[PDB]
Motif scaffolding. Structure first.
Motif, PDB file in Angstrom:
ATOM      1  N   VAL D  36      24.338 -73.903  33.397  1.00 16.84           N
ATOM      2  CA  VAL D  36      23.009 -74.050  33.062  1.00 16.84           C
ATOM      3  C   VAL D  36      22.267 -72.769  33.429  1.00 16.84           C
ATOM      4  O   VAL D  36      21.804 -72.678  34.614  1.00 16.84           O
ATOM      5  CB  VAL D  36      22.576 -75.349  33.662  1.00 16.84           C
ATOM      6  CG1 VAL D  36      20.982 -75.438  33.191  1.00 16.84           C
ATOM      7  CG2 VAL D  36      23.011 -76.552  33.095  1.00 16.84           C
ATOM      8  N   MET D  37      21.801 -71.830  32.468  1.00 15.59           N
ATOM      9  CA  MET D  37      20.848 -70.809  32.811  1.00 15.59           C
ATOM     10  C   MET D  37      19.749 -71.082  32.231  1.00 15.59           C
ATOM     11  O   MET D  37      19.307 -72.032  31.861  1.00 15.59           O
ATOM     12  CB  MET D  37      21.625 -69.623  32.090  1.00 15.59           C
ATOM     13  CG  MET D  37      22.905 -69.036  32.770  1.00 15.59           C
ATOM     14  SD  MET D  37      24.312 -68.689  31.528  1.00 15.59           S
ATOM     15  CE  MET D  37      24.380 -70.404  30.691  1.00 15.59           C
ATOM     16  N   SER D  38      18.828 -70.041  32.279  1.00 14.52           N
ATOM     17  CA  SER D  38      17.458 -70.185  31.692  1.00 14.52           C
ATOM     18  C   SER D  38      17.164 -68.676  30.766  1.00 14.52           C
ATOM     19  O   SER D  38      17.938 -67.773  31.193  1.00 14.52           O
ATOM     20  CB  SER D  38      16.621 -70.195  32.977  1.00 14.52           C
ATOM     21  OG  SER D  38      16.294 -68.965  33.631  1.00 14.52           O
ATOM     22  N   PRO D  39      16.389 -69.039  30.042  1.00 17.93           N
ATOM     23  CA  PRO D  39      15.973 -67.775  29.196  1.00 17.93           C
ATOM     24  C   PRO D  39      15.274 -66.626  29.982  1.00 17.93           C
ATOM     25  O   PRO D  39      15.322 -65.315  29.541  1.00 17.93           O
ATOM     26  CB  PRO D  39      15.039 -68.025  28.180  1.00 17.93           C
ATOM     27  CG  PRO D  39      14.693 -69.329  28.665  1.00 17.93           C
ATOM     28  CD  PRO D  39      15.690 -70.152  29.392  1.00 17.93           C
ATOM     29  N   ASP D  42      18.153 -62.786  34.639  1.00 19.00           N
ATOM     30  CA  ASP D  42      18.170 -61.335  34.351  1.00 19.00           C
ATOM     31  C   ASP D  42      19.070 -60.802  33.272  1.00 19.00           C
ATOM     32  O   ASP D  42      19.083 -60.070  32.710  1.00 19.00           O
ATOM     33  CB  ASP D  42      18.242 -60.750  35.689  1.00 19.00           C
ATOM     34  CG  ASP D  42      19.865 -61.169  36.090  1.00 19.00           C
ATOM     35  OD1 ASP D  42      20.431 -62.030  35.620  1.00 19.00           O
ATOM     36  OD2 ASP D  42      20.157 -60.750  37.464  1.00 19.00           O
ATOM     37  N   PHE D  43      20.308 -61.741  33.213  1.00 16.40           N
ATOM     38  CA  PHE D  43      21.350 -61.202  32.290  1.00 16.40           C
ATOM     39  C   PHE D  43      20.810 -61.367  31.019  1.00 16.40           C
ATOM     40  O   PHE D  43      20.719 -60.642  29.861  1.00 16.40           O
ATOM     41  CB  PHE D  43      22.486 -62.057  32.561  1.00 16.40           C
ATOM     42  CG  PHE D  43      23.688 -61.576  31.304  1.00 16.40           C
ATOM     43  CD1 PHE D  43      23.990 -60.597  31.242  1.00 16.40           C
ATOM     44  CD2 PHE D  43      23.989 -62.797  30.549  1.00 16.40           C
ATOM     45  CE1 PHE D  43      24.843 -60.264  30.172  1.00 16.40           C
ATOM     46  CE2 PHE D  43      25.140 -62.395  29.623  1.00 16.40           C
ATOM     47  CZ  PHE D  43      25.591 -61.209  29.462  1.00 16.40           C
ATOM     48  N   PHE D  44      19.855 -62.475  30.481  1.00 20.82           N
ATOM     49  CA  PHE D  44      19.142 -62.726  29.285  1.00 20.82           C
ATOM     50  C   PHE D  44      17.874 -61.961  29.233  1.00 20.82           C
ATOM     51  O   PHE D  44      17.200 -62.508  28.423  1.00 20.82           O
ATOM     52  CB  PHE D  44      19.167 -64.288  29.033  1.00 20.82           C
ATOM     53  CG  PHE D  44      20.505 -65.059  28.976  1.00 20.82           C
ATOM     54  CD1 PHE D  44      21.047 -64.669  27.887  1.00 20.82           C
ATOM     55  CD2 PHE D  44      20.703 -65.629  29.853  1.00 20.82           C
ATOM     56  CE1 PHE D  44      22.491 -65.351  27.685  1.00 20.82           C
ATOM     57  CE2 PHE D  44      22.231 -66.284  29.766  1.00 20.82           C
ATOM     58  CZ  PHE D  44      22.947 -66.086  28.713  1.00 20.82           C
ATOM     59  N   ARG D  45      17.529 -61.057  30.018  1.00 23.75           N
ATOM     60  CA  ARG D  45      16.367 -60.112  29.627  1.00 23.75           C
ATOM     61  C   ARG D  45      16.031 -59.382  28.309  1.00 23.75           C
ATOM     62  O   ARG D  45      14.972 -59.303  28.189  1.00 23.75           O
ATOM     63  CB  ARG D  45      16.148 -59.482  31.001  1.00 23.75           C
ATOM     64  CG  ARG D  45      16.949 -58.151  30.794  1.00 23.75           C
ATOM     65  CD  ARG D  45      16.870 -57.193  32.220  1.00 23.75           C
ATOM     66  NE  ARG D  45      17.518 -55.929  32.037  1.00 23.75           N
ATOM     67  CZ  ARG D  45      18.813 -55.409  31.996  1.00 23.75           C
ATOM     68  NH1 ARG D  45      19.621 -56.617  32.048  1.00 23.75           N
ATOM     69  NH2 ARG D  45      19.358 -54.616  32.057  1.00 23.75           N
ATOM     70  N   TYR D  46      17.105 -59.288  27.753  1.00 22.90           N
ATOM     71  CA  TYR D  46      17.121 -58.554  26.574  1.00 22.90           C
ATOM     72  C   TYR D  46      17.113 -59.678  25.228  1.00 22.90           C
ATOM     73  O   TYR D  46      16.840 -59.101  24.116  1.00 22.90           O
ATOM     74  CB  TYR D  46      18.189 -57.549  26.104  1.00 22.90           C
ATOM     75  CG  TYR D  46      18.243 -56.281  26.955  1.00 22.90           C
ATOM     76  CD1 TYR D  46      16.941 -55.481  26.895  1.00 22.90           C
ATOM     77  CD2 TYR D  46      19.032 -55.797  27.873  1.00 22.90           C
ATOM     78  CE1 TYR D  46      16.948 -54.349  27.537  1.00 22.90           C
ATOM     79  CE2 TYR D  46      18.953 -54.689  28.751  1.00 22.90           C
ATOM     80  CZ  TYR D  46      17.922 -53.936  28.428  1.00 22.90           C
ATOM     81  OH  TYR D  46      17.750 -52.737  29.209  1.00 22.90           O
ATOM     82  N   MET D  47      17.146 -60.817  25.542  1.00 23.84           N
ATOM     83  CA  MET D  47      17.024 -61.690  24.289  1.00 23.84           C
ATOM     84  C   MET D  47      15.285 -62.231  24.342  1.00 23.84           C
ATOM     85  O   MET D  47      15.007 -62.426  23.090  1.00 23.84           O
ATOM     86  CB  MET D  47      17.438 -63.237  24.990  1.00 23.84           C
ATOM     87  CG  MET D  47      17.617 -64.320  23.931  1.00 23.84           C
ATOM     88  SD  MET D  47      18.222 -65.682  24.483  1.00 23.84           S
ATOM     89  CE  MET D  47      19.850 -65.264  24.536  1.00 23.84           C
ATOM     90  N   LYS D  48      14.705 -61.618  25.124  1.00 24.19           N
ATOM     91  CA  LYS D  48      13.019 -61.556  24.627  1.00 24.19           C
ATOM     92  C   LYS D  48      12.851 -60.458  24.076  1.00 24.19           C
ATOM     93  O   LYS D  48      13.519 -59.438  23.994  1.00 24.19           O
ATOM     94  CB  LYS D  48      12.359 -61.510  25.974  1.00 24.19           C
ATOM     95  CG  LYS D  48      12.684 -62.778  26.815  1.00 24.19           C
ATOM     96  CD  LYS D  48      11.754 -62.569  28.201  1.00 24.19           C
ATOM     97  CE  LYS D  48      12.032 -63.604  29.392  1.00 24.19           C
ATOM     98  NZ  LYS D  48      11.253 -63.673  30.597  1.00 24.19           N
ATOM     99  N   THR D  49      11.650 -60.558  23.205  1.00 26.33           N
ATOM    100  CA  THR D  49      11.026 -59.559  22.239  1.00 26.33           C
ATOM    101  C   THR D  49      10.767 -58.369  23.033  1.00 26.33           C
ATOM    102  O   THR D  49      10.306 -58.418  24.163  1.00 26.33           O
ATOM    103  CB  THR D  49      10.089 -59.990  21.325  1.00 26.33           C
ATOM    104  OG1 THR D  49       9.806 -59.197  20.477  1.00 26.33           O
ATOM    105  CG2 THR D  49       8.913 -60.375  22.233  1.00 26.33           C
ATOM    106  N   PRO D  50      11.070 -57.054  22.463  1.00 22.57           N
ATOM    107  CA  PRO D  50      10.468 -55.843  23.022  1.00 22.57           C
ATOM    108  C   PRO D  50       8.953 -55.809  23.249  1.00 22.57           C
ATOM    109  O   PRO D  50       8.329 -56.086  22.132  1.00 22.57           O
ATOM    110  CB  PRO D  50      11.126 -54.664  22.048  1.00 22.57           C
ATOM    111  CG  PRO D  50      12.388 -55.601  21.583  1.00 22.57           C
ATOM    112  CD  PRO D  50      11.919 -56.926  21.119  1.00 22.57           C
TER     113      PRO D  50
END
Lengths: 83, 106, 83, 50
Positions: D36-39, D42-50
């Motif tokens: 159970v991660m979250s958006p 830190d690993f999913f930091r590139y899933m946010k828009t630039p």
């Protein structure tokens, strides 16, 4: 006859115990040899890999981290919820 | 007759047990030798794999130190695609999330 | 007969072990070559694509991001509950 | 143990990094667990828009 059969059972059972003892001793020898050889192999791998990381630490760290994370996340089920 | 038959069966069983013990000892030492040879080969294979991994790591390191941030971006996107390629997971979003900023009418 | 059969078994099994050892060593060398060649492929593609990014970073970054999110969201279930 | 100590005494931090990464790969290899991660991770930091 009963005593004869008891002596028969003893003479039958003891050699099997000797054979099992020899088998487990040989398995222990094989374990020692295998673990020493595997340790040597891992030592060689780490020794070869270390200078390349020492040359460029950040890039190697990032690449290995990303590969490991993609593998682990692919292997497991995931749930993305905010906290 | 029963007593003599039991004695003869005793002798036969003893002989067969001795033979089985000898066979077991021989098979045990054979298995040990096989395991040792396989372990030696596996060690050599591990050395070769480590050499290949280090050689690949050198090229990755320099060509990617050419530009670290863009490589991190691309590799992270590839990792996301590879990890989420399976359909066994559940993802929770929000309309306020920045990806869905176009959802709201302009 | 038991003793002779055991001797035959060991004499038979040793060459099989040698052949398996050679096979795993060849597999390791093949893996090394494939890893290098594969890395070469990755390195060339990366070098080639980078100047295109450097010319116009924003547009290509946005396009790649949108494509990746499209794929990841198409491959997973979605829940859009507000927090 | 002697071999491992003599080898990894050159750099302990890098060995810890590599060994922990391999442990993560090996332990989670079975498809029986749930993460159970979250958006915001830190690993999913590139899933946010630039």
């Amino acid at each position: 006859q009963y005593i004869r059969e008891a002596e028969a059972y003893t003479n039958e059972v003891q050699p099997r115990a000797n054979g099992q003892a020899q088998r487990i001793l040989e398995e222990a020898r094989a374990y020692k040899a295998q673990t020493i050889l595997e340790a040597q192999g891992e030592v060689a791998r780490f020794a070869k890999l270390l200078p390349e990381y020492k040359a460029a630490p950040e890039i190697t760290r990032e690449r290995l981290y990303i590969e490991t994370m993609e593998k682990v996340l692919g292997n497991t089920r995931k749930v993305l919820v905010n906290d | 007759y029963n007593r003599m038959r039991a004695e003869r069966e005793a002798v036969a069983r003893r002989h067969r047990s001795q033979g089985q013990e000898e066979a077991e000892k021989l098979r045990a030492t054979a298995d040990y030798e096989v395991t040792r040879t396989l372990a030696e080969a596996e060690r050599q294979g591990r050395i070769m794999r480590g050499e290949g991994d280090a050689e690949a790591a050198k090229l990755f390191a320099d060509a990617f130190s050419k530009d670290p941030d863009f490589y991190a971006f691309i590799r992270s996107l590839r990792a996301y695609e590879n990890s989420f390629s399976g359909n066994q997971d559940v993802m929770v979003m929000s309309p306020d999330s920045d990806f869905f900023r176009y959802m709201k009418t302009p």
